[PDB]
């Protein structure tokens, strides 16, 4: 099961990643 | 042992239908295709059909597709053959034979049945008329029996202990009637017919 | 002399009359593991350098995919470029 | 055929890094069309 | 086999449609159309990789009649995707997730 | 003539073999007879279909040739050579499938984020 | 269309111990799919060869098939009195199969017929019929000819001890007929035996 | 290693249906930054 | 003493002999003479380098000797076993030489970045 | 099962600078 | 037929470059390596080298590998000697000799050639006719030609093959008149044999 | 190199005969030999090679032997065609070596003395010549007596091939002076010494 929870854990990985950048550039950048 | 036993000899009439069995033993009977092959005249032989016993797909031969129509009980392991408005061509032996089920063994036939003698005819069930024969003037006597139906009959001689030099001649039809006729040479000529219940015993005397 | 190689059940090895003098490669019969594995070596008994390339890890790239690939990799680090420009 | 399988592994590496510089490039379009 | 005229016989990625008949010239045909005339001593035509599955009518032709031809199917997949449980749902994952990222940004752009 | 019809579902590979219309098939692979009465159940017979479930690679794959009841093996006018990866629930993604989902996803894509434009649109 | 299999002879001359052959004629070339059965005298048939050259299970080596293309041949030695059988040969490429008419064997010297002249008896008078009856019995070969001078004909098979044959000629009339005439004659050929009413 | 190959294809597809879904949103975005330019 | 040299690239097969210095070599395989056959052009013997293009794995593998002009086949104790494949536009790496390029795209894609953002800052 | 792995680990390492930098910009 | 062809004689003077030529027929010309062989005296034998036709590569005798270059002309499918610098020494028999392409049948010459006899020491000098005179001997004696061969006949027999002294043949004949024929000098005198 | 040579570098042996041909090497060639005929008018042919084998074109009348270092080339039922040289070839090592090569009643010289002619005079020289023809083995020596004096120097010898009618040689033994040095002597001699010998003088006054 090992490539398909790469890809699976590729998608998390981006998923959290953006969320962090999209809060960190938020709150530390205002609007 | 591998063996095909069918059923008996069987009678029907003009425009009737008919059904003979075969029963296949000795053998995987779903795996081997049945052929039904007619026997007319005596003589000649003519494949009428094959049976698949496994998918029920029957092969006819154009003569006879209209003529038979051929199935399979297959918890018994039993073939069957109806003939549909039988004429006085189908009086005839049928023969079921095991061919291979493929292509490969399909076109030989391994194994027969032993064959039903099955008959058509207008008329129905006569009692016989037998006759003895005397010379006008080794001498030889005659004993026919003509105007019976259906077949067979035994034609014995002083109840069976004149039996050396006797010819019974096979019968042989017309006006939908047997006749059949016995040559001793040397008297009482004895004729059982089953089929009628009658049992004839014709001393023999000169004219 | 010829020296044999046997490769049989997967498996390269070498079977010779003496004690087989290895100097250079991969190190009366002389194991070298398996075939996929790509044995290279120099034997001299009483010599033969073998090598294979049965590849393992080999791909097969066509130039269509190849090239496709690279030049939308090089139009998205120009727009990733032209991001950080937009940016100052 | 091991070489078609290895090959689409390494395509599917290239999409994955596509598909990264895209989604990098594209939050920072968002944050841009946001940030006037 | 040699006998009812099937001469075209089907042997690494790429596969060998040899053919069996006089070895001077086979004009070999592709759907009943002229595609191939291979002279000496090449006798098996490579049709490509097993993993490009060729299809179809496939017949070889020597100094005598045309043999009869024969079909090509392979079905070696290299495109084929599994529809196991978590395959899907690892796709349902991805359409979703992907669609709602999508929506957040566009709605994020209300201004 | 009228080419073999090969239907690969799963594991289970069809062989349809339209000419000889109305006549008894039988089909012979690797030049042994198949269809009948066999050990394997797998390998079963129609009025016109050949079916091979649990198809497997390395026997079952070779040379299938449809024949009429009665004519022989070598007397048909066509042969079929097949050898087929199979696995459960794959299906081949052909250009005309590809086309239509990834057509149908940017439809779904663009209607989408136009209705969560609109959404936030109201909501401004 | 079908293949009209035909046999040379329908009934063939042999002798005990002796070898014979039979010839098949096929109308089309059927690449050796013939084969040859035997049909016993009280029905029961049997195959011997297939395509052309096979020995079946359990059939004895004195049978042997041979030939090619539309000709094929039995070739049958050391005939015992089981094998006194008539012989098939059946076609295998298309449908339907076909069977020839087969060639019976017969088993001696030329012999001239007993022949036995039988007038009507009274009890078929009584009845209303006449009939006439002619047996020529154990003459060879099965060829004859009988002519009745003023039809119904039944032959016996081969005996097994005098290996003849025997032939019942029957002619029947009603009463009317059968006084209309006197004098009644019936002639076997291939010895002329008569009587008066 | 043939599933190995299913899942890469799959995640072929996969990843080119994402990679459409960001080029349609770098679409939009490039039809708003140029009606922003106009 | 020196070993061949063997480059495997696509669907074409070089082998090399340097251990005979400027001799005219000529090559044999699994003692069959090959090289300079005036026919079947794919195998070539153009100097040191037999150069073997559509490289069958069933047929064309097996011993390789080349032996100098003047030199039996029969004397020459130094052979070569050759054992390749023959995928086309298919070369050969491991997980390093891919996160190598891979690692290389990270670089110069970061190096860009930072350089027009500070290009475009100054 | 290796170079996805590799993907994985450089997506990894921008999210663990991102949230040094979250971490750093928290206090 | 399979045969290999020569020059002629090609009279050639010393310290120049002669070209022996060799057309191969009745087989394929690239096929089968061609070796030179110089036989001196007429007696000894010599491998001088031997070349490659398909390739074009040229493996010499160590003896001759200042003295001959070999070349391939394949359109006319004929191999060339070029003999470079070559002294009166390097007047002898040269043969071309065809072997295998390959070791296994490179060893020994199947096919040879008829022969180029590149005599090398002069120009056409007339010739000197000299009668010999006491059965009886008579004899002609022809010096001071250069070079061979003269037709002598006798009344239009023993002739002597002719020998070299400081480049000048000489030549003998025993059995009355002498005839001498010298293509080369394009002399022809006739002298008739009286006795002293 | 190696050295391969002929012990016997000529034999005599008749016609209808199987005599055989000897060649040594330096060292051991490994049966690497070819033996080849060439006919006296010039073409030569592969006769053997590998010390065994035959030519297509061969006939079976020459087989070849030996081994190491020795080897040899047996001829059986020699014809007219079969008169020629026969030269075995080394091919083991590089540069291939050959030899010299085998040639394949007892009478005696016509010694015909035969002095210059008044031409010669005229000319400035003076050839004094000795014909010796019609004779057999081919072993001999013209010793050259001018005024009863040894003279070696100006020997010309011109030997003619063993013919096919006669099987014998023909030799032409001339000297070659000036016309003041053919006058400064008045006898001169040629002797034909073979193991007996044939003298012949004149005098020049």
């Known amino acids: 099961l090992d490539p398909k929870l790469c890809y699976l854990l590729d998608g998390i990985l981006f998923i959290y990643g953006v969320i962090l950048t999209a809060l960190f550039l938020r709150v530390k950048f205002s609007r | 042992e591998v063996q095909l036993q069918q059923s008996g000899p069987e009678l029907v009439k003009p425009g009737a239908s008919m059904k003979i069995s075969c029963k296949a033993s000795g053998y995987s009977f779903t795996g081997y295709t049945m052929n039904w092959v007619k026997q007319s005249h005596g003589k000649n032989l003519e494949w009428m059909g094959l049976i698949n016993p496994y998918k029920g797909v029957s092969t006819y031969n154009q003569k006879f597709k209209d003529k038979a129509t051929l199935t399979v009980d297959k918890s018994s392991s039993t073939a069957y053959m109806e003939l549909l408005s039988l004429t006085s061509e189908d009086s005839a032996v049928?023969?079921?034979?095991?061919?291979?089920?493929?292509?490969?063994?399909?076109?030989?036939?391994?194994?027969?049945?032993?064959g039903t003698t099955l008959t058509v005819f207008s008329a129905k069930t006569t009692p016989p008329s037998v006759y003895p024969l005397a010379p006008g003037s080794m001498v030889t006597l005659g004993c026919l029996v003509k105007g019976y139906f259906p077949e067979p009959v035994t034609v014995t001689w002083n109840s069976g202990s004149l039996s050396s030099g006797v010819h019974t001649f096979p019968a042989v039809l017309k006006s939908d009637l047997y006749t059949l006729s016995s040559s001793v040479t040397v008297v009482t000529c004895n004729v059982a017919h089953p089929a009628s219940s009658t049992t004839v015993d014709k001393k023999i005397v000169p004219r | 002399f010829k020296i044999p190689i046997e490769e049989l059940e997967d498996r390269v090895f070498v079977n010779c009359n003496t004690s087989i003098t290895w100097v250079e490669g991969t190190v009366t019969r002389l194991d070298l593991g398996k075939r996929i594995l790509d044995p290279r070596g120099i034997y001299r008994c009483n010599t033969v350098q073998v090598h294979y390339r049965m590849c393992q890890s080999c791909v097969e790239l066509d130039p269509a995919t190849v090239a496709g690939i690279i030049v939308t990799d090089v139009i998205a680090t120009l727009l990733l470029a032209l991001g950080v420009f937009c940016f100052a | 055929h091991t070489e078609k399988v290895n090959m689409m592994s390494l395509t599917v590496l290239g999409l994955r890094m596509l598909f990264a510089k895209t989604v990098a490039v594209n939050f920072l379009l968002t944050a841009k069309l946001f940030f006037l | 086999s040699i006998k009812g005229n099937h001469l075209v016989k089907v042997y690494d990625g790429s596969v060998l449609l040899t053919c069996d008949a006089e070895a001077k010239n086979i004009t070999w045909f592709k759907d009943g159309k002229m595609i191939g005339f291979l002279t000496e001593d090449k006798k098996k035509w490579n049709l490509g990789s097993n993993a490009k599955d060729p299809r179809g009518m496939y017949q070889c032709k020597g100094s005598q009649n045309k043999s009869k031809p024969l079909q090509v199917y392979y079905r070696m997949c290299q495109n084929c995707i599994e529809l196991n449980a978590a395959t899907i749902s690892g796709f349902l994952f991805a359409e979703i997730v992907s669609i709602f990222v999508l929506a957040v940004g566009v709605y994020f752009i209300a201004g | 003539q009228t080419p073999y019809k090969v239907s690969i579902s799963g594991t289970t590979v069809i062989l349809t073999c339209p000419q000889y219309p109305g006549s008894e098939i039988l089909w012979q692979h690797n030049d042994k007879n198949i269809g009948g009465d066999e050990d394997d159940k797998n390998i079963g017979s129609d009025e016109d279909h050949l079916s091979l479930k649990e198809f497997s690679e390395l026997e079952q794959s070779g040379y299938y040739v449809c024949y009429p009841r009665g004519s022989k093996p070598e007397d048909a006018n066509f042969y079929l050579y097949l050898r087929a990866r199979v696995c459960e629930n794959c299906m081949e993604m052909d250009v005309m499938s590809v086309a239509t989902i990834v057509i149908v996803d940017i439809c779904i894509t663009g209607g989408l984020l136009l209705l969560v434009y609109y959404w936030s649109k109201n909501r401004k | 269309m079908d293949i009209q299999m035909t046999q040379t002879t329908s009934s063939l001359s042999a002798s005990l111990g002796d070898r014979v052959t039979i010839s098949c004629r096929a109308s089309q070339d059927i690449r050796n799919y013939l084969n040859w059965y035997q049909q016993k005298p009280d029905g029961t048939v049997k195959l011997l060869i297939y395509y052309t050259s096979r020995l079946h299970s359990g059939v004895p080596s004195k049978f042997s098939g041979s030939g090619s293309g539309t000709d094929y041949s039995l070739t049958i030695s050391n005939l015992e009195q089981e094998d006194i059988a008539t012989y098939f040969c059946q076609q295998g490429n298309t449908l339907p199969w076909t069977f020839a008419g087969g060639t019976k064997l017969e088993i001696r010297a030329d012999a001239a017929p007993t022949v036995s002249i039988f007038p009507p008896a009274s009890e078929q008078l009584t009845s209303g019929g006449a009939s006439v009856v002619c047996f020529l019995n154990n003459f060879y070969p099965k060829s004859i000819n009988s002519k009745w001078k003023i039809v119904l004909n039944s032959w016996t098979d081969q005996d097994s001890k005098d290996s003849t044959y025997s032939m019942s000629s029957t002619l029947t009339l009603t009463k009317n007929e059968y006084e209309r005439h006197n004098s009644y004659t019936c002639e076997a050929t291939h010895i002329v035996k008569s009587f008066n009413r | 290693t043939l599933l190995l190959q299913l899942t890469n294809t799959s995640a072929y597809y996969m990843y080119l249906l994402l990679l459409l879904k960001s080029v349609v949103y770098f679409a939009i975005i490039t039809c708003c930054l140029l009606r922003r330019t106009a | 003493q020196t070993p061949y040299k063997v480059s495997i690239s696509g669907t074409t097969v070089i082998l090399t002999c340097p251990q005979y210095p400027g001799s005219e070599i000529l090559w044999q395989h699994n003692d069959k003479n090959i090289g300079g056959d005036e026919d079947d052009k794919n195998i070539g013997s153009d100097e040191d380098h037999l150069s073997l293009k559509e490289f069958s794995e069933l047929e064309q593998s097996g011993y390789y000797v080349c032996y100098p002009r003047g030199s039996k086949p029969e004397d020459a104790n130094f052979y070569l076993y050759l054992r390749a494949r023959v995928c086309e536009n298919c070369m050969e790496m491991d997980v390093m030489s891919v996160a190598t390029i891979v690692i290389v795209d990270i670089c110069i894609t970061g190096g860009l970045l930072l350089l027009v953002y500070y290009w475009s800052k100054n | 099962p290796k170079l996805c792995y590799l993907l994985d680990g450089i997506l990894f390492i921008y999210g663990v600078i991102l949230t040094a930098l979250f971490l750093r910009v928290k206090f | 037929e399979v045969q290999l062809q020569q020059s002629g004689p090609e009279l050639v003077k010393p310290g120049a470059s002669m070209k022996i030529s060799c057309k191969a027929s009745g087989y394929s010309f690239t096929g089968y390596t061609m070796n030179w062989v110089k036989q001196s005296h007429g007696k000894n034998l010599e491998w001088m080298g031997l070349i490659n036709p398909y390739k074009g590569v040229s493996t010499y005798n160590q003896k001759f590998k200042d003295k001959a270059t070999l070349t391939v002309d394949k359109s006319s499918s004929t191999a060339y000697m070029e003999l470079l610098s070559l002294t009166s020494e390097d007047s002898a028999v040269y043969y071309c000799?065809?072997?295998?392409?390959?070791?296994?049948?490179?060893?020994?010459?199947?096919?040879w050639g008829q022969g180029t006899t590149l005599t090398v020491f002069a120009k056409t000098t007339p010739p000197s006719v000299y009668p010999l005179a006491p059965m009886v001997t008579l004899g002609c004696l022809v010096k001071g030609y250069f070079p061979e061969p003269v037709t002598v006949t006798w009344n239009s027999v023993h002739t002597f093959p002719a020998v070299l002294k400081s480049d000048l043949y000489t030549l003998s004949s025993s059995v009355v008149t002498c005839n001498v024929a010298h293509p080369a000098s394009s002399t022809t005198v006739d002298k008739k044999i009286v006795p002293r | 190199d190696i050295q391969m040579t002929q012990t016997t570098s000529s034999l005599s042996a008749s016609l209808g005969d199987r005599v055989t041909i000897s060649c040594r090497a330096s060292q051991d060639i490994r049966n690497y030999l070819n033996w080849y005929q060439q006919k006296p008018d010039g073409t030569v042919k592969l006769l053997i090679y590998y010390t065994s084998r035959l030519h297509s074109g061969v006939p079976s009348k020459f087989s070849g032997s030996g081994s190491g270092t020795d080897y040899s080339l047996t001829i059986s039922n020699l014809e007219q065609e079969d008169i020629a040289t026969y030269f075995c070839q080394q091919g083991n090592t590089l540069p291939w070596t050959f030899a010299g090569g085998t040639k394949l009643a007892d009478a005696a010289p016509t010694v015909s003395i035969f002095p210059p002619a008044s031409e010669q005079l005229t000319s400035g020289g003076a050839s004094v010549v000795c014909f010796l023809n019609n004779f057999y083995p081919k072993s001999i020596n013209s010793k050259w007596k001018i005024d009863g004096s040894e003279r070696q120097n100006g020997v010309l010898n011109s030997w003619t091939d063993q013919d096919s009618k006669d099987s014998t040689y023909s030799m032409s033994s001339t000297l070659t002076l000036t016309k003041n040095e053919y006058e400064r002597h008045n006898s001169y001699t040629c002797e034909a010494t073979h193991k007996s010998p044939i003298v012949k003088s004149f005098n020049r006054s």
């Open positions: 000799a065809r072997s295998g392409y390959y070791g296994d049948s490179d060893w020994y010459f199947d096919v």
